[PDB]
C-alpha cells in the first residue's frame, strides 16, 4: 500500500511515522519547565490554543542524541492526544511501497512499536507506530 510518511533523522539514524498523524512542525522556543518531570520530557508549550507536551523521542526509543544540536519539534496528532517530539533535522514527505518494506524487528529496542523497516535508496528508514509510542509516555 502507498503510505506517505514524514522522514527525519536522529544522530544520522533514519526514522518516520505517517502524515495522517501530524499537526505541524516548529523550532523550539521557550518550552515551559514542569517540576518533577520524567527523563524523556522537556516540558509544555501552548500551540493552536492547546497545551502540548514536548517529549524527547530518542529517550523513549533508547538511542543516542545531542540536546544542543536537536532543535526541531514535530507535533503529532492522534484521536486521543497531540504531543510534540523534539528531534534533529527533518526531510519531509515520502511515499513508501510494500515491496521495499520488511517486518524483521527481532533485535530492536522499539521493535514492537515499529510497523516495519523501509529499505529505500540505500537507507534504513524505520517505520514507527505513533499509538504504541504514546501509550508508553502516559502515566
Amino acid at each position: 500500500k502507498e503510505f506517505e510518511v514524514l522522514s527525519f533523522e536522529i544522530d544520522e539514524q533514519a526514522l518516520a511515522f505517517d502524515v495522517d498523524n501530524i499537526e505541524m512542525v516548529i523550532e523550539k522556543s521557550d518550552i515551559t519547565p514542569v517540576p518533577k518531570s520524567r527523563h524523556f520530557v522537556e516540558g509544555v508549550i501552548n500551540l493552536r490554543g492547546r497545551i502540548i507536551p514536548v517529549v524527547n523521542l530518542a529517550k523513549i526509543l533508547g538511542i543516542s542524541f545531542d540536546e544542543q544540536k536537536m532543535k526541531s519539534i514535530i507535533v503529532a496528532r492522534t484521536k486521543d492526544v497531540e504531543v510534540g517530539f523534539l528531534v534533529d533535522r527533518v526531510l519531509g514527505v515520502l511515499r513508501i511501497t510494500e515491496n521495499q518494506l520488511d517486518l524483521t524487528n527481532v533485535s530492536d529496542k522499539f521493535g514492537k512499536k515499529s510497523k516495519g523497516l523501509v529499505k529505500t535508496d540505500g537507507r534504513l528508514i524505520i517505520y514507527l507506530d505513533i499509538d504504541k509510542i504514546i501509550e508508553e509516555i502516559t502515566v
Binding site: 497545551i51 492526544v81 502516559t138
Partner: protein
C-alpha cells in the same frame, strides 16, 4: 490566586487557604532534628523552600526571603518564594497525562499575557 515567581517561573497560590505573607531573616531560620523551622509569634512553623520541594536548581547564597504561610487542616506550613507577581482570578486547566505522578500541582493555567502558571496543591507538600 496569588501569583508568585521562582526562577522567573509563575506558580499560583490559592488565596482562600492563606494566613499571612512575611519577609523573614536568614539569621532566624534553624533546624531542630528534622527539616527547617522558624519561630514566629513564639509558635514554631515548618518552613519549606519552594525550589527544594520541587527539586529545581536555584540560588546558592542566603538573603532575606519572602514566605507565604498557607493553612491546611488544623495547621499551617511556610512556603518560601522568590518574587511576588500579582493576584488574579484564574482558570484551572488539567496538568496533563504525562504528569499524573506529580502531587504538588493540582492544575495548570493560561494567564492573561499567555504565560503558563501551575497551581500549587495546599496538601501536596510535606
Amino acid at each position: 490566586a496569588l501569583l508568585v515567581k521562582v526562577n522567573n517561573l509563575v506558580y499560583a497560590i490559592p488565596i482562600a487557604n492563606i494566613d499571612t505573607i512575611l519577609s523573614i531573616s536568614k539569621e532566624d531560620i534553624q533546624r531542630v532534628q528534622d527539616r527547617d523551622v522558624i519561630v514566629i509569634r513564639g509558635e514554631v512553623i515548618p518552613v519549606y523552600r519552594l525550589w527544594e520541594v520541587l527539586q529545581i536548581e536555584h540560588k546558592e547564597e542566603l538573603e532575606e526571603m519572602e514566605a507565604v504561610i498557607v493553612r491546611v487542616g488544623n495547621r499551617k506550613y511556610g512556603i518560601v518564594v522568590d518574587d511576588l507577581l500579582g493576584q488574579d482570578d484564574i482558570v484551572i486547566k488539567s496538568l496533563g497525562k504525562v504528569f499524573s505522578e506529580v502531587k504538588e500541582f493540582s492544575g495548570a493555567a493560561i494567564l492573561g499575557d499567555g504565560s503558563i502558571a501551575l497551581i500549587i496543591n495546599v496538601s501536596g507538600i510535606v
